[PDB]
Structure 1
Amino acid sequence: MKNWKTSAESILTTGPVVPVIVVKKLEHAVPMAKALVAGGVRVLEVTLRTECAVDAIRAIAKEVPEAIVGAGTVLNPQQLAEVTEAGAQFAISPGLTEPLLKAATEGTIPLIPGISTVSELMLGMDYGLKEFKFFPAEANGGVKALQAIAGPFSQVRFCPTGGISPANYRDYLALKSVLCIGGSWLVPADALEAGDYDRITKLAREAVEGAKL
Structure 2
Amino acid sequence: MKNWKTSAESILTTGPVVPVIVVKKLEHAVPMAKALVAGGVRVLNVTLRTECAVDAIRAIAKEVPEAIVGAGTVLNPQQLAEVTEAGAQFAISPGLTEPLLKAATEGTIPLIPGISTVSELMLGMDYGLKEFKFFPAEANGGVKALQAIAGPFSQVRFCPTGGISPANYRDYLALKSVLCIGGSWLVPADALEAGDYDRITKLAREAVEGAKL
Give the TM-score of the pair, scaled to structure 2: 0.99
Seq. identity, %: 100
CA distance, structure 2, for counterparts of residue 165 and residue 210 of structure 1 = 11
> Structure 1, residues 133-181: CA drift from partner, whole Å, max 9, x if none?
0000011111111211232101000000000000000000000110000
> Structure 1, residues 14-46: CA drift from partner, whole Å, max 9, x if none?
000000000100000000000000000000000
CA distance, structure 2, for counterparts of residue 192 and residue 77 of structure 1 = 30
CA distance, structure 2, for counterparts of residue 124 and residue 82 of structure 1 = 22
Comparing 128-137 with 186-195, greater Cα deviation is found at 186-195
Secondary structure of the equivalent of 1:112?
A: strand
CA distance, structure 1, for counterparts of residue 156 and residue 81 of structure 2 = 26
The aligned residue for residue 136 of structure 1 is 136
CA distance, structure 1, for counterparts of residue 50 and residue 68 of structure 2 = 20
The aligned residue for residue 53 of structure 1 is 53
CA distance, structure 2, for counterparts of residue 45 and residue 143 of structure 1 = 22
CA distance, structure 1, for counterparts of residue 189 and residue 46 of structure 2 = 14
Secondary structure of the equivalent of 2:133?
A: strand
The aligned residue for residue 211 of structure 2 is 211
The aligned residue for residue 97 of structure 2 is 97
CA distance, structure 1, for counterparts of residue 34 and residue 211 of structure 2 = 21
- 1:30-179 alignment, distance < 5 Å: 30-179=30-179
CA distance, structure 2, for counterparts of residue 171 and residue 158 of structure 1 = 13
Secondary structure of the equivalent of 1:212?
A: coil
CA distance, structure 1, for counterparts of residue 187 and residue 129 of structure 2 = 30
Runs of 4+ displaced beyond 6 Å: none
CA distance, structure 2, for counterparts of residue 118 and residue 84 of structure 1 = 28
* Unmatched segments (≥5 aa) in structure 2: none
Aligned residues: 213
CA distance, structure 1, for counterparts of residue 103 and residue 44 of structure 2 = 22
CA distance, structure 2, for counterparts of residue 7 and residue 126 of structure 1 = 17
Secondary structure of the equivalent of 2:185?
A: coil
Secondary structure of the equivalent of 1:139?
A: coil
Give the TM-score of the pair, scaled to structure 1: 0.99
For the aligned residues, what is the CA RMSD? 0.6
Secondary structure of the equivalent of 1:49?
A: coil
